[PDB]
Design a protein around this ligand. Structure first.
Ligand SMILES: O=P(O)(O)O[C@@H]1[C@@H](OCc2ccccc2)[C@H](OP(=O)(O)O)[C@@H](OP(=O)(O)O)[C@@H](OCc2ccccc2)[C@H]1OP(=O)(O)O
Ligand SMILES: Nc1ncnc2c1ncn2[C@@H]1O[C@H](COP(=O)(O)OP(=O)(O)NP(=O)(O)O)[C@@H](O)[C@H]1O
Ligand SMILES: [Mg+2]
Ligand SMILES: [Mg+2]
Ligand SMILES: [Mg+2]
Length: 325
C-alpha cells in the first residue's frame, strides 16, 4: 500500500499556486499518495472523521483550528513535518526571540514592554525625545517597536531628531504600499511591545526559506523601513534580488529549522555591521515563482517521507544526494 501524505491547512493555502506546484511533484513519487484535507472538514468535522495519513503537513494561518490539528496528530500519531505545538509559540514574538537567544542566534538587542491593559501607565517605560528606557534598558533612536503578537504587522520605526524625528509605520501591504511616514515621534501608549535596536542594512531584507535543515533558498526585497513604496517589475510582480547565503547564514538556517521544529520555515535576516541578524521567524512558507524551488522542495519533502517511513512499509529505498541552495 501507498504512503499517504496528508495536507492540513486553510483552503487559501492548500489551493495556492505554490502548494499545487509542490503537491503535483510530490505525487510523482511512486509510493506516495497525497490527500488534501477539505477546509469544510477541517472546520466543521471532528478530528475522528478526518482522513488518515502516515505523514502530516499542517500549518496555522488565519481561521485555522490549531487545537484540532494537534488533537488529530495526537489521535493518529503521524510523522509530523512541521511541529504543531511550536506553531502556538511562533505567534508570540517574545517566545520566538527567547528561542533564538537560547540557540546562540544573533538578533537585535531588545527589551520587552509588557503592559497591563487595565493600568497602561504603570509599565516600565520612560520616554525622552530621542530615546526610550524599557525596564531600565536604553534604546537611542532609531529603534523599532513591534507588537508582541507576531501576527500584528504594525511595526513602527522611530527616527532621531537629527534626521527629522517622526516615525515610519509599517503594515501588511495595501496595494502599492507597505509603510508610511508619520510626524508622530512618541511611542504607542496602549499594547505590549518589543523594543529593539535598528540594524543598519543596505535597504534590503533577506528572506530565507528552509526545506529541512540542509536546504535554504534566500532572496532579497526592498525594506519597508525605507519609503514604503512597493517595487514592481513591468509584469507587476514584486522585485526580488538574488542572494546566496554565506557559511554563517547557512548555519543560522539549520538552527532556525531545528529549533522551531519547522521543516518548511521562512525567516527574515538583516545583513548589518558585517553580521546577519534574525528579526522574525514566520514558520511554514513556500517560495513563489521559482520552478527550481518547486522541484527541490518537492524532492526533499518526498525523500524525507521515504527515509522516515520506507522501512515500515518494507519499501526499498537508498538515500540519494540533495542540494543546499
Ligand atoms: O485578519 P488580519 O490579522 O488583520 O490579517 C489577515 C491575514 O491573517 C493574518 C493572520 C491572522 C491570524 C493568524 C495568522 C495570520 C491573512 O493572511 P493568511 O493568514 O490568510 O495568509 C490575509 O491574507 P493573505 O496572507 O492571503 O494576504 C488577510 O485575510 C483577509 C481576511 C479574510 C477573512 C477574514 C478577515 C480577513 C488579512 O486581513 P486584512 O487584509 O483584513 O488585514
Ligand atoms: N531591528 C531592526 N532593524 C532594522 N530593520 C528592522 C528591524 N526589525 C524589523 N525591521 C524591518 O521591518 C520589517 C518588518 O519587521 P518584521 O520583524 O519582519 O515584522 P513582520 O511584521 O513579522 N514581517 P513578516 O511576518 O515577514 O510579514 C523587516 O522586514 C525589516 O525590513
Ligand atoms: Mg505518487
Ligand atoms: Mg518579517
Ligand atoms: Mg513575521
Amino acid at each position: 500500500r501507498q504512503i499517504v501524505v496528508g495536507i492540513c491547512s486553510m483552503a487559501k493555502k492548500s489551493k495556492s499556486k505554490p502548494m499545487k506546484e509542490i503537491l503535483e511533484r510530490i505525487s510523482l513519487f511512486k509510493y506516495i499518495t497525497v490527500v488534501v484535507f477539505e477546509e469544510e472538514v477541517i472546520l466543521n468535522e471532528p478530528v475522528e472523521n478526518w482522513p488518515l495519513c502516515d505523514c502530516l503537513i499542517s500549518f496555522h494561518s488565519k481561521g485555522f483550528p490549531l487545537d484540532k490539528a494537534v488533537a488529530y496528530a495526537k489521535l493518529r500519531n503521524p510523522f509530523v513535518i512541521n511541529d504543531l505545538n511550536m506553531q502556538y509559540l511562533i505567534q508570540d514574538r517574545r517566545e520566538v526571540y527567547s528561542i533564538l537567544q537560547a540557540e546562540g542566534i544573533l538578533l537585535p538587542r531588545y527589551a520587552i514592554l509588557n503592559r497591563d491593559p487595565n493600568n497602561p501607565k504603570e509599565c516600565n517605560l520612560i520616554e525622552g525625545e530621542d530615546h526610550v528606557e524599557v525596564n531600565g534598558e536604553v534604546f537611542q533612536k532609531p529603534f523599532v517597536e513591534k507588537p508582541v503578537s507576531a501576527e500584528d504587522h504594525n511595526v513602527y520605526i522611530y527616527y532621531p531628531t537629527s534626521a527629522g524625528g517622526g516615525s515610519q509605520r509599517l503594515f501588511r501591504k495595501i496595494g502599492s504600499r507597505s509603510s508610511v511616514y508619520s510626524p508622530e515621534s512618541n511611542v504607542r501608549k496602549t499594547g505590549s511591545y518589543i523594543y529593539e535596536e535598528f540594524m543598519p542594512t543596505d535597504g534590503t531584507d533577506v528572506k530565507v526559506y528552509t526545506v529541512g535543515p540542509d536546504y535554504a533558498h534566500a532572496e532579497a526585497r526592498k525594506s519597508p523601513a525605507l519609503d514604503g513604496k512597493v517595487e514592481r517589475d513591468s509584469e507587476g510582480k514584486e522585485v526580488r534580488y538574488p542572494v546566496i547565503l554565506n557559511a554563517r547564514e547557512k548555519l543560522i538556517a539549520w538552527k532556525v529549522c531545528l529549533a522551531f521544529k519547522q521543516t518548511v520555515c521562512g525567516f527574515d535576516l538583516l545583513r548589518a555591521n558585517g553580521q546577519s541578524y534574525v528579526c522574525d521567524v514566520n514558520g511554514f512558507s513556500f517560495v513563489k515563482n521559482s520552478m527550481k524551488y518547486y522541484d527541490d522542495c518537492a524532492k526533499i519533502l518526498g525523500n524525507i517521507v521515504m527515509r522516515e517511513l520506507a522501512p515500515q512499509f518494507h519499501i526499498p529505498w537508498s538515500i540519494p544526494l540533495e542540494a543546499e541552495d
